[PDB]
Symmetry: D2
Subunit: 283 residues, 4 copies
Amino acid sequence: LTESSTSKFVKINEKGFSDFNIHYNEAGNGETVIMLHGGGPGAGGWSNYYRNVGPFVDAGYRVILKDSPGFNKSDAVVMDEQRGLVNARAVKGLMDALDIDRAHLVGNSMGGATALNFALEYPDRIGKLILMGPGGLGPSMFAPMPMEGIKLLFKLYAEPSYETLKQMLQVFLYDQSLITEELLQGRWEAIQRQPEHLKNFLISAQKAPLSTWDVTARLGEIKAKTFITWGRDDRFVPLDHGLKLLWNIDDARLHVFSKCGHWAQWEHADEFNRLVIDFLRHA
Amino acid sequence: TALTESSTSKFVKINEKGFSDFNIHYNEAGNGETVIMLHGGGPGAGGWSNYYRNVGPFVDAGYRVILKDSPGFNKSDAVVMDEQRGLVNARAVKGLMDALDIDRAHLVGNSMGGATALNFALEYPDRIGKLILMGPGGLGPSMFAPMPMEGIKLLFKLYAEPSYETLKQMLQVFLYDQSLITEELLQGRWEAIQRQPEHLKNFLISAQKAPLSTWDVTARLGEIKAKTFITWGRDDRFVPLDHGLKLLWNIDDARLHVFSKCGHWAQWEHADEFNRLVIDFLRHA
Amino acid sequence: LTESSTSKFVKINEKGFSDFNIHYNEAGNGETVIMLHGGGPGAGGWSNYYRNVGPFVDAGYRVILKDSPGFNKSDAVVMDEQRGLVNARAVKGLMDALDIDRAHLVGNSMGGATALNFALEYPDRIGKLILMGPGGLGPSMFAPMPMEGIKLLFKLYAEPSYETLKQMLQVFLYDQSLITEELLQGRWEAIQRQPEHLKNFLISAQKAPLSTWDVTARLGEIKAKTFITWGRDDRFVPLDHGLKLLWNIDDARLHVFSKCGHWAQWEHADEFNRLVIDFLRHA
Amino acid sequence: TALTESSTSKFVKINEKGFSDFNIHYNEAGNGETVIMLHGGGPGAGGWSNYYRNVGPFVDAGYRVILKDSPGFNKSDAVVMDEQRGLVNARAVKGLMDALDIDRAHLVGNSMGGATALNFALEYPDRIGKLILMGPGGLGPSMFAPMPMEGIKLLFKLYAEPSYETLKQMLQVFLYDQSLITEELLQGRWEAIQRQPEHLKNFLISAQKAPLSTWDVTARLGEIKAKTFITWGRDDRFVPLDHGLKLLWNIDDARLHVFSKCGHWAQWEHADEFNRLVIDFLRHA
């Protein structure tokens, strides 16, 4: 199982959304789990969830790694509203076009920002809500912000290089000698091959200061069943936010992996797969 | 054999470190990889009472399950302790393993039993498999919660003035959803208090000799090599939630799981999630 | 200096506010500091700030311990909106009638809920903002709620007795053998002499679940200069909230007394007087 | 005499515990009740550099102010330490008091100096007056912040590869408002690095012998009887804010003050508030 190889594109037409194409990787048959990737230079469905797609499939799942608008092999965009809203409107839209009643959502960081927005707007279109170190949520009660990884992320968006990209990924892992070439090079290329995307993301953050993403006062509204996951060592979104989530989502559980950076799903792939499949199978 | 409190009920004498032909009450079913479950420290606590919603599912998953009554609780022998209970309780757990020919056991510990499970991994690293913690005590001050917490000290009020009403108040504070309480649980804790009044009095004497602060093993948590699963009820009014980060940060190989809408007793109030999550951890972590 | 003795009443006429009288204690000349008391059975300006009034005056201040509506020797009321709003509308109204341009506000708990509401609505009518263990602010990230003291407070509102009142005050102090007769009996009497107030407060909490008080999403708006104080051992409002405050008020400082219950101003009167007078004189 | 870095500049030999005719650089003005100020642990730190915005106001308030250069920083003697620096630095503070006939001193400690101030109150309870802490290190893991924090380890990068640019990056991370930085502060830290290159190398050697974890005195905080004033910058990217609750909870008589919009250096970035608040505390607490 690979990329190319699960490679699938699809034109979508929701809200303010004339013929816009989304690339995404897909596989298996079943109940539908969509995986939403993080917000940083050269992030896709496949780079973010390439360690998870197989196990989740080997488990009776129809899995779609989504390329959210303005990312990897999707179609470039500039937004005037928070990418959480927009991005989600895009989801409600890949569903409709692939004709899909309900999905399970797994959302990393910006992904998690999306997944939450989707649950807010499209309450009847979502199965179970899995949040992994999700972005947006206001200030930490303990971390100075911008956090180290946000500062590295904007560094990378503004002046992209390979040296600065490694710098970034090392901050992204607890154990940084886990960095592989597959990971490094994959991202290095959605960067090379989609330069328009770096430029467009900053402009959008110009229109939409990342403080505009804050769903907090509206968290009381989420009816979906939520699993909040976090790496103990997240240098990118703060830990205490899993608690913010925990106390504000009617039906939530928190799990925190130790010795794990921002990406629980890649760095703690095994436990992550297990915990989530299991949550999906039985919660 | 059908699995009931009496059908599982057993006794063994232990002879570890100053225990000498000291009688341990426990409840045992299943066969194979051993899981010993260690109960909390309130009046009338016992293995069966803390863990009767967990024992069947753990046995059915292929474990041999031991619900041990610590020294000075329930049907075990009485004792006035002049040392911290977590360490004393951990010698007793070793003593029971020795007597029963058990080389290594996974530990599930609630509160005083989480304290006890921590000391056991510190003192006998070679006798432990996995370590499961469920709002353990023995962990010092909280960075947020004024102490003694509410639960604590309904606990102490109940030890000094045992009454049926204070017992109900205490148990309710253990729960997020107070209506889940049953008259039978209550009556079970109440019989255990009434039929062993000496344990309450010996508890208070023991605590004078060795206040709760002497149970704090924070400075040694870095020695724990057991793979660790810490669990907390979000709504625990007995031991503070930030202690689950304390463990998460201070033990080498830990992970933490918080259940929402859950008092102190996650294994009882969320038995089903708890059983499923801890069984998986045992099998695959 | 005493009660009676600073005793002053005054009819007020703001928003939905036909001739309503407020009792309040007053003294000295100067810049105006209004002190707003907490939300529990038999709480006034004088019982709450009787340890502070003298020092603050001895320091060149015109001090007014305000009886917020539906409390002590004021006029009973039932509210359909959060007492923070309402209570503040009352402030904007005692000012106008005593003809007062600007005030310094010190607000304990419900007081603090008020003081904050006043800063939100009447941004040009307030000097410096002193918050002491202020109420309302959403859920804690660490304390189970209702907190112990809230549960005792509602206990006392619903079935008032002297036994339950002592129970309550002991939870209110870190060191509870500091309880005096002046304190005990003062409260025991706004209880006896204002039974209508117990009844009316519950009804209001009926219309206005204390979760309606949450100013949080609007904290970015406060332009006043704020001093957040808390007792380390507050069993009534959570500690972590001084951090919520700290991170969301443009100009804030946090101070936390140790070995101190909910009432820093009474239990740590000396340091409290000093810290606040000093903040008032020089921040 | 006018109060300038050189007009205050002095040396004394100390002979405490294995220090023997070891030369301490310090900056001193004023007379009376003594306040000793203990600087942090980054490359090029010294008493004057950490505290030149505080010394005039403390002297003017009626204190005798001592800005001490710890062993192996700035103009003090060089040293490779095989023990934790906080304890070693605290013996040196005692040695300087002894040599100077000072019976008791109030301590203000920043970071490594907060660590140093803690050890000093533990080891010599009778030689301390009040204890003022300003984001002290020596306090173990954080319950929220991944470690090493950002600041830490620009600190270590700068110790191993001293450069003017990494120095600027480091100092900026110390600040909430990065533009408050001055070329003269920078140039002062840079001269101190260049003129005593051995201190950086001896620092890294010392830390190999005694990692930062050996500086953690959390288990003994309960012995501190000094009346304590802990202060933190909200925005400290060098030592974690939750450690200010750790102290607040674990020291008998403490209070905590957090300045908003403030990096690690509250005494510099909020000098004025800091000076006023710490002076009052000294006078009236």
